[PDB]
RNA sequence: UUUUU
RNA sequence: UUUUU
RNA sequence: UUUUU
RNA sequence: UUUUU
RNA sequence: UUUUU
């Protein structure tokens, strides 16, 4: 009975919204890598050297490298892929810039896969004492942890081993602001660089004030 | 003689209300899973791997897993189904989110079946000493115990083995408020998470005050 | 007459539920160690040094070590196994992390065996005056006491020497909350650690307030 | 190792 | 010299 | 002039 | 050895 | 007599 979706006014209904909304899109936020671009990255890695038989596990090993040392432009992954010698993970880390993809965006795609292949063993990430995570939440001490809680990750058929607790998210939240601010004190509140604005100085006057005086630069 | 139900005013009568009220619905409360959705869950389990011959007993075994460790999102069921190897109960526990069903809602559907297959033997649930249930009411020490007292459960032709006593309900009532409050003291009275509101702290100052001072946070 | 378990709706019955439910599983809760993993731990101990003739008694001696000093990651068992010199129980305590098993989970497997080899003599655990257990319930003053009341323990053919009384469980319940809170006052309600959040301070302002003022941090 | 309406 | 789910 | 695990 | 929108 | 990523 109800017709005319071209009116641009009429109310939508349950059976229409269930089937016309073709899974919306997926969950294509700009902070996470789309499956179309990584498909082309699968092609270029196989074109560069890899076999078509083993590709995904090289992505998961590279994601586990990003799980250990945190995601950045100067991350420095240092290691060869388990597929074969000579091909360094630095070459795969350098290739991301050709297709306009950030490693931070790329690693959230395999955040559930990292969480699966991390939590099955009793092995944590390489560094969790510096950032200030507790021993109970030491497995959660890594970048792209928000990739487990969103639909953008691949979400395999078996599913996640366990749903992350609120204490992991709360610890990851304050650790982000703590780690970002700790960096921001060293060379913050200026954008020009150059040398004329910043006559010398460059870095701030340490993070030692934070423990003594609440206000910071 | 009495006619015109479309008047929207006239009084209803015994023979009309007996037959026009087609069993009302069944007892479709949102806290318990409807038989239409579990029928589709029976289809997806058979589609995933199971045979059509044995399906219900896999639900009852999964319900007995929920009977042991209590119903939650981070429950962690850890075990293979008795139908066949490889298919973990974690995969069935992960599949509930596709059809917008909670495990807590699902397990109340087989609460009478769990009560039947529990009470026929002399075996209690895995944990009844921590929650504080007495040895007489140790069989009642499990989640979805309210599923036995409502019509939403399947209520098989043989019926229940025994009607639960008031001491089981009274023990289950105070155990709910005790178990919920015990959790609530650890990270209660805040919803934002994030890290800016909760600067650190996170957890409360233990449940050891409860035994000494009546008022709590 | 009654057929079709693949319908995913039909009611289950007594003779079907008696035999189709193949002992459910056993009582596989995540808080207690499964018999499959300890079988591999039996292999690695024999591979490391032990004979296949004597293995179980080394587990029971190690369980009796966990009976004395309470189960923890910093427990510090300090002693050689009675099988042979050189092989310390610290090495067996360190080996648990390879197979993703906690000592707390492991020791509940031999809780009935500890209760049998403790109660046959008139010897209690090493420390029962500090935790606040009475002389009547001094034998019950140890961790993994909930392992006697569940089916996960091995339950030998002779059975338990005696069924634990309600006074032992009630004393063990309040002793858990007392011991946990006593620890929680020292470095509680914060998860980041690090040094920036906790400028100094670290520990709370003692448990001496508990005896004077009911509310605590 | 009971989060709801 | 009881950290959990 | 009780520091622990 | 968390730079964003 | 803790310089980093």
Author numbering:
A (entry chain A), B (entry chain A), C (entry chain A): 21 to 237
Copy out sentences from the published article reporting this entry, exactly as the authors wrote them:
Flexible filamentous viruses are ubiquitous plant pathogens that have an enormous impact in agriculture. Their infective particles are non-enveloped and flexible rod-shaped virions and contain several hundreds of copies of a coat protein (CP) arranged in a helical fashion protecting a ssRNA of positive polarity, or (+)ssRNA. Pepino mosaic virus (PepMV) is another potexvirus which has emerged recently, progressing from endemic to epidemic in tomato crops causing severe economic losses worldwide. PepMV is transmitted by mechanical contact and virions contain a (+)ssRNA of about 6.4 kb. The PepMV CP is strictly required for cell-to-cell movement of the virus.
We present the cryoEM structure of PepMV virions at 3.9 Å of resolution. The cryoEM map reveals a left-handed helix with a diameter of 130 Å and an inner narrow channel of 13 Å, and the structure shows a pitch of 34.6 Å and 8.7 CP copies per turn. The PepMV CP structure thus generated has three major regions: the core; an N-terminal flexible arm; and a C-terminal extension. The first 20 amino acids in the N-terminal side are not included in the atomic model because the region projects outwards, and its density vanishes due to high flexibility. Each CP binds five ribonucleotides, so that the entire genome of PepMV would require 1290 copies of PepMV CP spanning 510 nm (3.95 Å of axial rise/subunit), which agrees with the 509 nm length originally reported for the virus. In order to explore the protein–ssRNA interactions, we modeled a polyU and included a set of four PepMV CP monomers in a molecular dynamics flexible fitting (MDFF) simulation. The results show that the RNA resides in a continuous groove with a high electropositive potential constructed by CPs from consecutive turns of the helix. Three polar-charged residues, R124, D163, and K196 might establish H-bonding contacts with this RNA base. The N-terminal arm from the Ni subunit interacts with a hydrophobic groove of the Ni-1 subunit and establishes the main side-by-side contact in the helical arrangement. Thus, the C-terminal extensions are responsible for the axial interactions that support helix formation.
